[PDB]
Amino acid sequence: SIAWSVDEFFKNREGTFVIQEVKEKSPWVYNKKRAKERFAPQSTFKVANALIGLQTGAVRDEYDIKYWDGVKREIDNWNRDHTLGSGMRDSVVWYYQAMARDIGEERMNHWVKAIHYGNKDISGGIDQFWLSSTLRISPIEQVRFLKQLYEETLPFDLKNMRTVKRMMVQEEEKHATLYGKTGSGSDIGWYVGFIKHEHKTYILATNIKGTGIEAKDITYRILKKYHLMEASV
Ligand SMILES: *C(=O)[C@@H]([C@@H]1N=C(C(=O)O)[C@H](S[C@@H]2CN[C@H](CNS(N)(=O)=O)C2)[C@@H]1C)[C@@H](C)O
């Protein structure tokens, strides 16, 4: 068991860290107050959105191509054709908005409720509800959801859970694979996912007052401290 200590990574940011080995009964929590507070999921919702898009048949697989509509958006890399998988890696909002519209209100509502995704409130709008809007989920709830994704106990087809986990690969190392997703907006910084290291798997959520990139950085530093992730050798 790991004697977690992470205060040194949160000196300049208000934040929380939730982490749980999959055989452990409960997560370890830094800043329990913030860990139980629900926040807009921002781009971390792409994990659930992709599962639901695949389950409903709104998209075919991780290679389902959608065509750029020629509208120049804020991030250059968005201004080209994308797939479900490249859309998750590059957090391509327009792809996932198009998918959400195809899923539609009734199916999205059902599946968001079925997986107990925070307050389950998508009334903010079918392609808007996850960005600083009506839907909110706590860091503890993200870990509960991602634990079920990892252990394949969500009410999705096995194939769809395996597809989405492949789409989430963030770092590949000799003895580990990090899976995860950043979220940013309205000073809510997320990094959520799980790390497989040898025969142990840790489900995690980092949430700060700050950005997704900052949350991801904090996460890497914690995982490195405890040798779940290799150092920069
Ligand atoms: C996801 O969290 C957001 C969407 N994903 C994005 C991404 O690039 O991963 C962008 S966030 C956008 C990029 N640059 C702006 C400022 N960056 S900062 N200060 O946050 O680091 C913000 C896109 C909006 C969203 C759906 O929540």
Experimental method used, please?
Answer: X-ray
The residues carrying an active-site annotation are 43
Distance 221 CA to ligand 1 centre (A): 21
**Structure-token pair, residue 84:** 């479900």
- Dist CA 39 CA 14 (whole Å): 14
Which residue's alpha carbon is at the smallest distance from atom 18 of ligand 1? 211
Enter the resolution in angstroms: 1.4
Q: Are strands 176-183 and 169-173 parallel, antiparallel or unpaired?
A: antiparallel
Distance 199 CA to ligand 1 centre (A): 34
In the chain, the domains with their CATH numbers are 1-233 (3.40.710.10)
Q: In DSSP terms, which residues pair with 28 in a beta bridge?
A: 19
Cβ(43)–Cβ(95) below 8 Å: no
- Dist CA 126 CA 146 (whole Å): 23
**Structure-token pair, residue 181:** 């997703």
Q: In DSSP terms, which residues pair with 206 in a beta bridge?
A: 17, 191
Ligand 1 pocket residue status of 91, Cβ below 6 Å: yes
- Dist CA 226 CA 137 (whole Å): 27
| CA–CA–CA angle 158, 88, 177 (5° rounding) | 65
Ligand 1 pocket residue status of 93, Cβ below 6 Å: yes
- Atom number in ligand 1 closest to CA 189: 20
Ligand 1 pocket residue status of 182, Cβ below 6 Å: yes
- Dist CA 150 CA 204 (whole Å): 11
Distance 185 CA to ligand 1 centre (A): 6
Please provide the distance, in angstroms rounded to a whole number, between the alpha carbons at the two ends of the chain: 26
- Residue owning tokens 């950085």: 217
